[PDB]
Design a binder for this molecule. Structure first.
Ligand SMILES: CCCCCCCCCCCC[N+](C)(C)CCCS(=O)(=O)O
Ligand SMILES: O=C(Nc1nnc(-c2ccncc2)s1)C(F)(F)Br
Length: 350
């Protein structure tokens, strides 16, 4: 037998014998993740056991799309698949999927808690924009980027873990919704720069060490948006739905706080000329990402040209060729659970 079983993270992992000393590092609706030592490669890996991938079609579609995209994308800021396996021997008995990834050291939530340092902050944001640009060039518009879905190594290298809605913006989760763009929440449709709002939310959270737009539901979240950024222009209420406009237009009108008041100098490293320069540049970039109307919001390509980020720009990292997803009808075609299962089983078997 090439497999062995170990109970870890209150779950039974049945894995290849090359993977040793499993230790829980994370959990969620998608699955349970362990760190492990891979004796074949002499390196530490992360193993994700997918949680109930065939419980329904949303789980099955998510599992198939995650597996296909993690194989096909090859980029330093997107997590890569090192191995995938199932311990079951037939399609009839097939139930469990294990993804093996390179082990990162922390997620971005943990990193966000550290004291803001402009070299680290700008580098993390640069890498996020690099990964997002690469996903966008393949038609993958994430729409649910959040700090828990982004992992970081001790040397501050950064990888995005998941693909959001991919080449599909309704999201049935069955969650953390504080990073979703106004045009997603309000049901207006989206373009590529929907993901820039989420980066802006993460960036503002790195500076304030508080969630920018927290709240129990989207009603509360929208109130936090307009209180801080101001009631949007009627050119936006016009693009808005004639029904949902009524609630939004009848909210109290807010001027919004200026970005100097939203992100005051008190939040930034002080008392060097370099730090004074960088506070102004960071606030300027925030003011161009945290824009309610996506028609007025900076693009990924222009954010990479912004002076706060562009110090890091290397064409070899930014301008890599787009992945060719030959598997069309992905994120559009629906299938029965049995059909998704066969599709996933073929992908696991390579
Ligand atoms: C303060 C919270 C308000 C929540 C408002 C809920 C709004 C309901 C959304 C329905 C919009 C459907 N259409 C217009 C067809 C666009 C669908 C395309 S996409 O899904 O927006 O990409
Ligand atoms: O946390 C989750 N997913 C993850 N996927 N990969 C992860 C990882 C962690 C550390 N190093 C490498 C990879 S954690 C979830 F299941 F709750 Br959606």
């Amino acid at each position: 037998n090439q497999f062995y079983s170990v109970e870890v993270g209150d779950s039974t992992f049945t894995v290849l014998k090359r993977y040793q000393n499993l230790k829980p590092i994370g959990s969620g609706a998608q699955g349970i993740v362990c760190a492990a030592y891979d004796a074949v490669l002499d390196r530490n890996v992360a193993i994700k056991k997918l949680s109930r991938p065939f419980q329904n079609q949303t789980h099955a579609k998510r599992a198939y799309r995650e597996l296909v995209l993690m194989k096909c994308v090859n980029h330093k800021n997107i997590i890569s698949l090192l191995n995938v396996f199932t311990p079951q021997k037939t399609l009839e008995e097939f139930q469990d999927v294990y993804l093996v990834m390179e082990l990162m050291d922390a997620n971005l939530c943990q990193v966000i808690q550290m004291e803001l340092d402009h070299e680290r902050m700008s580098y993390l944001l640069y890498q996020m924009l690099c990964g997002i640009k690469h996903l966008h060039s393949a038609g993958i518009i994430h729409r649910d980027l959040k700090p828990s879905n982004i992992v970081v190594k001790s040397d501050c290298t950064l990888k995005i873990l998941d693909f959001g809605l991919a080449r599909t913006s309704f999201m049935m989760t069955p969650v953390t919704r504080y990073y979703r763009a106004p045009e997603v929440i309000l049901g207006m449709g989206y373009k590529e720069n929907v993901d820039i709002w989420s980066v802006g939310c993460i960036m503002g959270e790195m500076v304030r060490h508080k969630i920018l737009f927290p709240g129990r539901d989207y009603i509360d979240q929208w109130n936090k948006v307009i209180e801080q950024l101001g009631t949007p222009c009627p050119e936006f209420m016009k693009k808005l739905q004639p029904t949902v406009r009524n609630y939004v237009e009848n909210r109290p009108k807010y001027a919004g706080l200026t970005f100097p008041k939203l992100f005051p100098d008190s939040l930034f490293p002080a008392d060097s000329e370099h730090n004074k320069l960088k506070a102004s540049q960071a606030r300027d970039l925030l003011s161009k990402m945290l824009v309610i109307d996506p028609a007025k919001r900076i693009s990924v390509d222009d954010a990479l040209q912004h002076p706060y980020i562009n110090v890091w720009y290397d064409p070899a990292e930014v301008e890599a060729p787009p992945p060719q997803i030959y598997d069309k009808q992905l994120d559009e075609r629906e299938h029965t659970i049995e059909e998704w299962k066969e599709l996933i089983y073929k992908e696991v078997m390579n």
